[PDB]
Amino acid sequence: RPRFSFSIAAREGKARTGTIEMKRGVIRTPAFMPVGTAATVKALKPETVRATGADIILGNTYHLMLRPGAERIAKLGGLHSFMGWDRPILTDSGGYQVMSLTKQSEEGVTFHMLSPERSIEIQHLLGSDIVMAFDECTPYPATPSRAASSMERSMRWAKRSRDAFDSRKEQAENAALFGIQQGSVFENLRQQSADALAEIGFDGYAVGGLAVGEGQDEMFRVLDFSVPMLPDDKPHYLMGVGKPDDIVGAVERGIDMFDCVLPTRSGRNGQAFTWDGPINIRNARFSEDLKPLDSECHCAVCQKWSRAYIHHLIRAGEILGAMLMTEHNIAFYQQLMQKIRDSISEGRFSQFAQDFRARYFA
Amino acid sequence: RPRFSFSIAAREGKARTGTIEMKRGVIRTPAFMPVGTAATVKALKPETVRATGADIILGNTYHLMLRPGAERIAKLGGLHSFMGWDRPILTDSGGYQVMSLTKQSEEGVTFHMLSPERSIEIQHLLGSDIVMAFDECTPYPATPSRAASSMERSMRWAKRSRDAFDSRKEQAENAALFGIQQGSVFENLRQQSADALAEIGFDGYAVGGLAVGEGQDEMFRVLDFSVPMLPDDKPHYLMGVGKPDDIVGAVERGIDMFDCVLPTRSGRNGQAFTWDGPINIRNARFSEDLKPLDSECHCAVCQKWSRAYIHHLIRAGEILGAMLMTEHNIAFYQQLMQKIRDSISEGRFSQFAQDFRARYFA
Ligand SMILES: Nc1nc2c([C@@H]3N[C@H](CO)C[C@H]3O)c[nH]c2c(=O)[nH]1
Ligand SMILES: Nc1nc2c([C@@H]3N[C@H](CO)C[C@H]3O)c[nH]c2c(=O)[nH]1
Ligand SMILES: [Zn+2]
Ligand SMILES: [Zn+2]
């Protein structure tokens, strides 16, 4: 079992499909990572997360470093053992969220003090498989001079992340490290950032600082020039994205990995994803609808329960409502990724994207 | 498959163990019925309820008759289809809860008007397997004259329940009807009530009007003379009871069936049942405890996750916390019932009760 091996099996335009082999399992790409806020993917057992097709989850670090604490989780055997997920876990670096949810210096972020060295050690203690570099959160909007300052600090922090990771033998031998490109919406800064990260060298490269309110057109415009700046032979990870159409468009532009809270969070709020677009199951029109949430979905929820029942559960505030909506939405996201992988493999992803959009927005 | 066949396989003192065969499945007795408030056993899929060992669940009618409504549930295919539980369901009659949570007349309860005929029709529409007679809620405490009035109205309502049930062919042929003994804490009224119910004739007999604040000593004193008043050859159902020690003591006094919200409700509130007594998992003493909730429990929760993890989930307000606590508590209740059945079968229930109490209250 390799530490980290990315292999591209097929291409179509800028889109790629393939695999990342790691010690704890294989990740099929393009990949969607369910988000686990506080050592749980909300309302799902890990076996259910796996049953939906997920190969890897994202563990939020910002929450866990406070309570229970990274040292405590390590004492209890690590995050995998703690939460009962034995496959790869990507951990975010914590500083971004802290600033997003503070006082910044060259040393790190104060809120307690979080430094790039401390971030890597926390992720080490959690037993992370994919470690993110410690980066800074750029405000949006931001002046070129302001985005440049943040990006450059992030690049210096990326070097320190690299060194801290490399100094930890167990981590360097068993885990992978991703750098995070910054530079807001500006092409020249995205280039300098890419250049800096490539000079350092990482196992994978994330596009950070997007989905911060710029809108899809702008996000896509930024991806258009930003993704080709990254090393072609390494995975490309778009952080915090997104809606199904965001994902399809991002894959068309060379992205291999995704995470976002939308399927879980909007699931609990009554929004279900379908191939004909999102529906809100609380709507009165579903009160006697015996069809499943989606007519084609292969998930366990759509095999057994009706829209009418789930409508009732969510309106009654029942936990099982949240459970069923969440399992379906995560499964829908995984079936989307599977359709993306198959269509790229088969050289018909362009047609899939067109067919998908025509029906989803009909 | 029989409509309703109760067979006693073994006795020990007043305790009995055996089976109720019904069209939708076999019920092992003594039986515990998880409570499903609004067409869900809170935080559990039906498959998980079954996995814990439950043979039958209780469906609360008071909630369902309002929303979604009994007619609507019938239009959608019945309660079994609606919620995805294909085994027996006992439905309560609704009037008791309405008064407990009103204006009473000979016709029924106004809050809308709920009559014994309407109650049976509602339970018919839900597709109930065990239909409860429509009874009145006696206040506690209550004067002999006051408990007598309520009990007598309940007995007249029991006759009307019987007639409404018998007039519905599909119901009479496929379902069972239980009468409910009332009479508060008074022996002579319990006798008159038993006599009245026996004169009418039912498939099973419930002891109603207990666990209303009288305390365990008094409840047991009432059961002491009340249960022998019921037909020996029919099941005895103690409604709304209870804590594990309540159950053991009630079986010692001839009870065959139980329901209560304690394992589900107190599960969500952080209380876990163990053979060494209840624990509150939120307590700081569990924060680094790697043991399962209970050292012997065979449930899926205790096979995989630690006290420390569940402590974290409940303190974080995570849905998975409620899910895991609830599955364990329901499983614990079922393992309790299994131990009760086996020990009666083997003629060592007296010793089991003593051993159970010595350890549970140690
Ligand atoms: N380190 C870091 N993390 C993120 C994220 C992560 N994505 C999660 C889902 O939006 C939230 C946060 O954990 C979005 N953008 C960034 C980003 O630019 N940097
Ligand atoms: N019809 C009826 N129902 C009950 C109950 C039921 N038991 C549930 C759990 O306490 C609540 C309610 O549905 C308790 N006591 C009685 C009772 O005496 N009568
Ligand atoms: Zn589905
Ligand atoms: Zn257990």
UniProtKB/Swiss-Prot annotation, chains A, B:
Pathway: tRNA modification; tRNA-queuosine biosynthesis. GO terms for cellular component: cytosol. It comes from the Bacteria. Gene3D superfamilies: Queuine tRNA-ribosyltransferase-like (3.20.20.105). Signal peptide: none annotated. It catalyses: 7-aminomethyl-7-carbaguanine + guanosine(34) in tRNA = 7-aminomethyl-7-carbaguanosine(34) in tRNA + guanine. Its cofactor is Zn(2+). Substrate binds at residues 92-96, 135, 182, 209. InterPro entries: ArchSynthase1/Queuine_TRR (IPR050076), TGT (IPR004803), TGT-like_sf (IPR036511), tRNA_ribo_trans-like (IPR002616). Homodimer. Within each dimer, one monomer is responsible for RNA recognition and catalysis, while the other monomer binds to the replacement base PreQ1. This is Queuine tRNA-ribosyltransferase. It comes from Zymomonas mobilis subsp. mobilis (strain ATCC 31821 / ZM4 / CP4).
